[PDB]
Amino acid sequence: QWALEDFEIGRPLGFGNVYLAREKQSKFILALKVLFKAQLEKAGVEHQLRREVEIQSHLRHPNILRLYGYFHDATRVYLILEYAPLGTVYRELQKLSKFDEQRTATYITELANALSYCHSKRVIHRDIKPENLLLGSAGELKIAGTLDYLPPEMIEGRMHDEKVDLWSLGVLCYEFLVGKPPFEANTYQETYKRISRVEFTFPDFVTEGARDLISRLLKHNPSQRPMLREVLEHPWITANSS
Numbered sequence: 646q647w648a649l650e651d652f653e654i655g656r657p658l659g660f661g662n663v664y665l666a667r668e669k670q671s672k673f674i675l676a677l678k679v680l681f682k683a684q685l686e687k688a689g690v691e692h693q694l695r696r697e698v699e700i701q702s703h704l705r706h707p708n709i710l711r712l713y714g715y716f717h718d719a720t721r722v723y724l725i726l727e728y729a730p731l732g733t734v735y736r737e738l739q740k741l742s743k744f745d746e747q748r749t750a751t752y753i754t755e756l757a758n759a760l761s762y763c764h765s766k767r768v769i770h771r772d773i774k775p776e777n778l779l780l781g782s783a784g785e786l787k788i789a790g791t792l793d794y795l796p797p798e799m800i801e802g803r804m805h806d807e808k809v810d811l812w813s814l815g816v817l818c819y820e821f822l823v824g825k826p827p828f829e830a831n832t833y834q835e836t837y838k839r840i841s842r843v844e845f846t847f848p849d850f851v852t853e854g855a856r857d858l859i860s861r862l863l864k865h866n867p868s869q870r871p872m873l874r875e876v877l878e879h880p881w882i883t884a885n886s887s
C-alpha cells in the first residue's frame with residue numbers, strides 16, 4: 646500500500662496529468678499517473694482500469710512499459726508507472742518527419758516481439774499508435790476515438806482475433822516511413838470508408854521491400870496477414886533491423 650507522501654512530484658509529462666516522480670526511500674525515478682476518481686466514475690471505466698492494471702502489472706517484457714503499482718487517495722487514483730526518458734515515438738516522428746528504413750525495421754521488430762509475447766499470453770492489444778509508443782534510455786521501444794489503426798473487421802463490428810495487431814503493425818510501418826497513416830483523412834467518415842475499402846497508396850520514396858511487407862500486413866482478410874514470426878523473418882526486416 647502506497648501513499649502520495651512517498652513521492653516527490655516533478656515536471657509534468659502529460660483524465661488527468663502524468664508527472665515525473667521520485668520515490669523518497671529509494672530515490673527511484675518513475676512516472677506517476679494522476680487520475681481523478683470523479684471522471685473515472687462518471688465514465689464508469691473504473692472496472693476497465695481494474696482489469697487493465699491487473700493485466701499490465703502481470704506482464705514482463707523489455708518492450709512493454711512496466712506498471713509497478715497503484716493506489717488511491719481522497720479523490721485521486723495514482724498509477725506508479727515506468728519512466729521512459731526519451732519520450733514518445735509520436736514526438737520523435739514529428740521532430741524528424743519520417744523514419745529511415747533501419748529505424749523503422751528495428752521499431753517494427755521490437756513491436757513484433759512485444760506483440761508475440763502478448764499473443765502468447767492471450768492478450769490482444771488493438772491500440773498501438775505512436776503516442777502509445779515510448780522510448781527507453783537506450784532508445785528501445787515501449788508499449789504503454791480515431792480510426793487510423795483499427796482493422797476493417799473491427800470498425801465493421803465483426804468478430805476479431807490476434808490478427809488485429811498485425812493490421813496495426815502495417816499501419817505503423819507505413820506511418821514510420823511516410824510520416825502519416827495510410828488511411829488518414831480529414832473526417833472520421835472518409836477514414837472509415839478508406840479503411841473498409843483498404844485504400845492506400847505509397848509515395849515514390851517507399852522501397853518495394855517495404856511496400857511488400859506493408860501490403861502483406863494490410864490485407865482485408867485477417868487470415869491472409871502473416872504471423873509475427875514471418876514479420877520478424879521478412880527480407881526487408883532482415884536487411885534493416887538490429
Ligand SMILES: O=C(O)c1ccc(Nc2ncc3c(n2)-c2ccc(Cl)cc2C(c2c(F)cccc2F)=NC3)cc1
Nearest residue numbers: 658659663676726727728729730731732733776777789
Ligand atoms: O516529452 C517529454 O519530455 C517526455 C514525455 C514522456 C516521457 N516518458 C514517459 N514515461 C512514462 C509515461 C509517460 N511518459 C507518459 C507521459 C504522459 C502521458 Cl499523458 C502518459 C504517459 C504514459 C502513457 C500511458 F499511461 C498510456 C499510454 C501512453 C503513454 F505515454 N505512461 C507513463 C519522457 C519525456
